[PDB]
Every structure is written in structure tokens, then in C-alpha cells.
Design an enzyme around this catalytic site. Structure first.
Site, PDB file in Angstrom:
ATOM      1  N   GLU A   1       0.866  -1.213   0.000  1.00 47.48           N
ATOM      2  CA  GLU A   1       0.000   0.000   0.000  1.00 47.48           C
ATOM      3  C   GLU A   1       0.892   1.249   0.000  1.00 47.48           C
ATOM      4  OE1 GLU A   1      -3.013   0.321  -0.707  1.00 47.48           O
ATOM      5  OE2 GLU A   1      -3.943  -1.651  -0.249  1.00 47.48           O
TER       6      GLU A   1
ATOM      7  N   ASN B   1      -7.492   8.874  -5.711  1.00 48.40           N
ATOM      8  CA  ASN B   1      -8.247   7.888  -6.513  1.00 48.40           C
ATOM      9  C   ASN B   1      -8.952   8.657  -7.639  1.00 48.40           C
ATOM     10  OD1 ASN B   1      -8.969   6.688  -3.280  1.00 48.40           O
ATOM     11  ND2 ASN B   1      -7.490   5.786  -4.684  1.00 48.40           N
TER      12      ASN B   1
ATOM     13  N   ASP C   1     -11.965   8.688  -8.546  1.00 44.57           N
ATOM     14  CA  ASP C   1     -13.267   9.186  -8.014  1.00 44.57           C
ATOM     15  C   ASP C   1     -13.089  10.457  -7.165  1.00 44.57           C
ATOM     16  OD1 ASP C   1     -12.070   7.821  -5.869  1.00 44.57           O
ATOM     17  OD2 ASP C   1     -13.989   7.270  -4.975  1.00 44.57           O
TER      18      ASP C   1
ATOM     19  N   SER D   1     -11.536  10.710  -4.197  1.00 41.08           N
ATOM     20  CA  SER D   1     -11.136  10.355  -2.823  1.00 41.08           C
ATOM     21  C   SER D   1      -9.612  10.237  -2.792  1.00 41.08           C
ATOM     22  CB  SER D   1     -11.807   9.087  -2.344  1.00 41.08           C
ATOM     23  OG  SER D   1     -11.442   8.053  -3.194  1.00 41.08           O
TER      24      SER D   1
ATOM     25  N   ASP E   1      -6.368   8.083  -0.571  1.00 36.38           N
ATOM     26  CA  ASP E   1      -5.913   7.054   0.390  1.00 36.38           C
ATOM     27  C   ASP E   1      -4.747   7.600   1.204  1.00 36.38           C
ATOM     28  OD1 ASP E   1      -7.708   5.420  -0.913  1.00 36.38           O
ATOM     29  OD2 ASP E   1      -6.185   4.212  -1.895  1.00 36.38           O
TER      30      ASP E   1
ATOM     31  N   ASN F   1      -9.066   4.999   2.880  1.00 35.34           N
ATOM     32  CA  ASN F   1      -9.739   5.768   1.816  1.00 35.34           C
ATOM     33  C   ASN F   1     -10.744   6.743   2.439  1.00 35.34           C
ATOM     34  OD1 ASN F   1     -11.578   6.406  -0.290  1.00 35.34           O
ATOM     35  ND2 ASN F   1     -10.520   4.900  -1.580  1.00 35.34           N
TER      36      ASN F   1
END
Ligand SMILES: [Cl-]
Ligand code: NA
Length: 129
Positions: free
Chosen positions: A35, A46, A48, A50, A52, A59
Site C-alpha cells: 500500500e 483515486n 473518483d 477520494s 488514500d 480511503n
């Protein structure tokens, strides 16, 4: 903070991750590796909109508030910045809520694609736990 492998295993073990909902410590270390590369300051946007955050790339869509993910929940009731700390309590406490949500560690796309079904115990080999 960019954690060492064994250091992060120790930290995750102390914060109650070891066999948390049946997931061995090495699953958690494997997830953090792919990660974030063990970097508490890791952020990734992301598609969309968002973001992380931190060592487990938690998220903003669901889990933390960053003030710029329209239509998002804060199910961990924290600012997303708390997930970039040197101290992993916030990350670990949020990860517990996540992994209890009923997809288990499948919530971490990198765990499903890169850690699931692999010899994950190799991630905690040579660590004083
Ligand atoms: Cl599970
Ligand atoms: Na949010």
C-alpha cells in the site's frame, strides 16, 4: 515516518492487529508494504476524487474526513491527516473498523491482489515480536 519491516510488525502487534479478526500479523505487514512501502506519509488520489492515507492507504470515501471528498462518510470519525502520523494508533484503530466491515482484508485491493494466498509469514521472519 518510513517504518522498518520488523518495527512496523512490533507496532501493529502492540496495537492489537495480530490475529485481529483471524488475520495473522504478516497479512498486515504485507498490506502496508504494497500500500505505502511502510511510509506513514503516503497519499494517493483515486480517480473518483477520494484519497488514500498513510501506511494502510485508508480511503476518504468511507473512513476519514479530508474536507474534499464530496458525498463521503467519516466512519472512523477522524481527520484523514491523523492517518499520516508517525504514531499508527489512528491507522490501526481505523483498520480494525474496516476489516470488521465484512469483506475482511479484501477492503485493501493490494492485500487481495498481492498478499492473499501467499506465504505472508515471510513478512514477520527475523522480527522480535
Ligand atoms: Cl475474514
Ligand atoms: Na470522508
Amino acid at each position: 515516518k518510513v517504518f522498518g519491516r520488523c518495527e512496523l510488525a512490533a507496532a501493529m502487534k502492540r496495537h492489537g492487529l495480530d490475529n485481529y479478526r483471524g488475520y495473522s500479523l504478516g497479512n498486515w505487514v504485507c498490506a502496508a508494504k504494497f500500500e505505502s512501502n511502510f511510509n506513514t506519509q503516503a497519499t494517493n488520489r483515486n480517480t473518483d476524487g477520494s484519497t488514500d492515507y498513510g501506511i494502510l492507504q485508508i480511503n476518504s470515501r468511507w473512513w476519514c474526513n479530508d474536507g474534499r471528498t464530496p458525498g463521503s462518510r467519516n466512519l472512523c470519525n477522524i481527520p484523514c491527516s491523523a492517518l499520516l502520523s508517525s504514531d499508527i494508533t489512528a491507522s490501526v484503530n481505523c483498520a480494525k473498523k474496516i476489516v470488521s466491515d465484512g469483506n475482511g482484508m479484501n477492503a485493501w485491493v493490494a492485500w487481495r491482489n498481492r498478499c492473499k494466498g501467499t506465504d505472508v509469514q515471510a513478512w514477520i521472519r527475523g522480527c522480535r515480536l
